[PDB]
């Protein structure tokens, strides 16, 4: 059938996302090797990551389920990692605009928070296909959920969205919202490794700490 | 089950007592020894925290449920010297709190009423706890009445 | 035995009812005394704390540190009765600006301890902290000679007692500045400090 193929141009298309997003690592400082399977330019796998996330973004929006929204984070990804160095990727944030409002709603027009609003999104995706299947991967065959990775989400979301809060007088992000959003974080979590676990709380701590939070 | 305590300003209790439904004879399965001092202390931040705010998220001795965190509502009062009457609400299910607010508002005035007749005394100084037993019967006929 | 500092109990509620001890209205009757009686404690006060000092500043400390002892009591009862029991009341502002609390001070808690409300309330114009609260006549001690200041300390204890216990702290300390017909004027000056006034210059 063509659900098929659209799943298996899905899954190639998330594979070159992270593959053109890992191509584009260590800023290509001196890399002008044979090259196998990359570009090692200036700004080229970067570009190329662009163009591979806006074609998962659209195989996915044309797919309409957790591996939806991975593009999605992706997409904001490759435009902050982009945003390390010199970036001017308007053209992918309009393509990015257009369908998160096609599929989504947007509603924001800031400076460094339509990435937040894109996370935000992108959990409820997930959060909706959470009623499905439990295991679609082989990696994953005797696991229990898929709360292992739906934590990691929402703690690389506090990580890049809590060091945006540094100041105190123009503060972008306000403390009572992004503490009634780690809130509704303490799910059932009890069995897990240890490891993830104390790196997790580690994480919650450093939060706490930065945020003044001491208690 | 209720969790109800009264705590001063540099962080210890001049008052705590637990009251349960009499059917669940035992009351709070397992949290009463180590969850319920920490989470109340955990509460303390944000009702330091919203002390000193103009617009909450009027008149700014009462406020609503601070927190809801593993289902338990948590109900907090601010004294005009600094006393804080932090209270928590605990079900086997989850509880609504906002629709006592005709009652459990008047349950802070006079349980306020009381700490203002314990202060009056001079030789009770703060930062003392509050060892009487009239106040004990006083507050648990209170807790009978605006249950 | 009912709290210690050592655990908690657990009692079922609608449980039976159990005996009646003691009570007593918390509103107040209105009761007077006479002015001598007032001074003649005040002055067995401070002729008690001159018997046991040696010298003057732990002598002012001592002072206000007994009126710190009322201020700490005075405002919760002073604040629930502007609030005002059993009947059914509505809780007050629960003030937090500066600019309020003496207001509050210079309108109830001077027309609650004398039958006068207090005189003038002014800022300092050539540097902020610094509060003026001024009467024209103090009735606590008008029967020392003028000269010295230090018995005039018990008052402004109070204001200390008031301030500090209400989440502004602060210190305090009194002149006597001669200005026109009154001898005897008494300025009370409220020095605060600067962790008070950048959370309020936290607050826009």
Redo the contacts between chains.
């Keep these: 059938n063509r659900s098929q193929q659209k799943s298996l141009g899905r899954q190639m298309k998330i594979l070159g996302n992270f593959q053109l997003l890992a191509g584009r690592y260590v800023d290509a400082l001196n890399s002008f090797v044979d090259a196998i399977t990359t570009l090692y330019k200036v700004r080229d796998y970067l570009w190329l990551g662009s163009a591979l996330d806006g074609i998962s973004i659209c195989f996915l929006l044309l797919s309409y389920n957790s591996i939806s929204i991975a593009a999605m984070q992706s997409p904001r990804n490759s435009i902050m990692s982009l945003s390390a160095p010199a970036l001017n990727i308007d053209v992918e944030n309009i393509n990015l605009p257009l369908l998160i409002k096609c599929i989504s709603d947007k509603v924001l027009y800031y400076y460094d928070l339509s990435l937040m609003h894109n996370s935000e999104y992108a959990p409820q995706v997930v959060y909706c296909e959470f009623l499905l299947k439990t295991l679609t991967f082989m990696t994953s065959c005797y696991k229990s959920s898929e709360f292992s990775k739906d934590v990691l989400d929402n703690i690389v979301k506090n990580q890049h969205r809590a060091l945006s809060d540094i100041p105190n007088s123009p503060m972008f992000p306000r403390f009572e919202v992004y503490f009634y959003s780690n809130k509704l974080f303490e799910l059932q979590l009890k069995e897990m490794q240890v490891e993830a676990q104390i790196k997790i709380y580690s994480t919650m701590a450093e939060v706490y700490r930065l945020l003044g939070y001491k208690r | 089950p209720q969790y109800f305590a009264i705590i001063g300003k540099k962080d210890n209790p001049v008052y705590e007592i637990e009251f349960t439904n009499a059917e669940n004879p035992q009351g709070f399965p397992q949290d009463l020894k180590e969850l319920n001092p920490f989470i109340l202390h955990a509460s303390l931040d944000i009702v330091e925290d919203l002390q000193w705010q103009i617009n909450p998220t009027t008149d700014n001795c009462y406020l609503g449920k601070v927190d809801h965190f593993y289902g338990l509502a948590i109900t907090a009062y601010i004294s005009y010297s600094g006393m804080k009457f932090v209270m928590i609400h605990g079900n086997s299910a989850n509880s609504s709190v906002v629709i006592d607010d005709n009652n459990m508002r008047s349950f802070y005035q006079e349980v306020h009423e009381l700490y203002v007749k314990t202060l009056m005394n001079p030789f009770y100084k703060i930062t003392d706890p509050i060892r009487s037993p009239a106040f004990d019967s006083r507050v648990r006929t209170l807790a009978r009445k605006h249950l | 035995?009912?709290?210690?500092?050592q655990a908690?109990?657990?009692?079922?509620?609608?449980?039976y009812?159990?005996?009646?001890?003691?009570s007593?209205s918390?509103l107040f009757k209105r009761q007077e005394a006479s002015l001598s009686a007032m001074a003649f404690l005040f002055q067995e006060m401070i002729s008690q704390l001159h018997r046991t000092c040696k010298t003057a500043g732990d002598f002012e400390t001592k002072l206000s540190d007994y009126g710190h002892?009322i201020g700490?009591?005075l405002?919760?009862?002073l604040?629930?009765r502007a609030?005002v029991?059993?009947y059914?009341?509505?809780?007050?502002?629960?003030d937090?600006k500066i600019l309020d609390i003496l207001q509050f001070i210079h309108g109830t808690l001077w027309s609650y301890l004398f039958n006068h409300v207090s005189d003038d309330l002014v800022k300092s114009s050539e540097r902020d902290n610094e509060y003026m609260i001024v009467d024209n006549f103090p009735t606590l001690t008008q029967f020392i000679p003028g000269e010295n200041v230090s018995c005039e300390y018990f008052v402004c204890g109070i204001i200390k007692g008031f301030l500090f216990?209400?989440?502004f702290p602060c210190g305090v300390t009194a002149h006597r500045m001669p200005q026109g017909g009154h001898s005897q004027r008494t300025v009370y000056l409220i020095q605060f400090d600067r962790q008070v006034l950048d959370?309020e210059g936290?607050?826009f």
């Design positions: 035995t009912v709290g210690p500092k908690i109990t657990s009692e079922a509620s609608t449980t009812i159990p005996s009646r001890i003691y007593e918390l002892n700490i009591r405002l919760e009862l604040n629930f609030s029991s059993n059914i009341t509505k809780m007050r502002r629960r937090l216990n209400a989440g959370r936290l607050r």
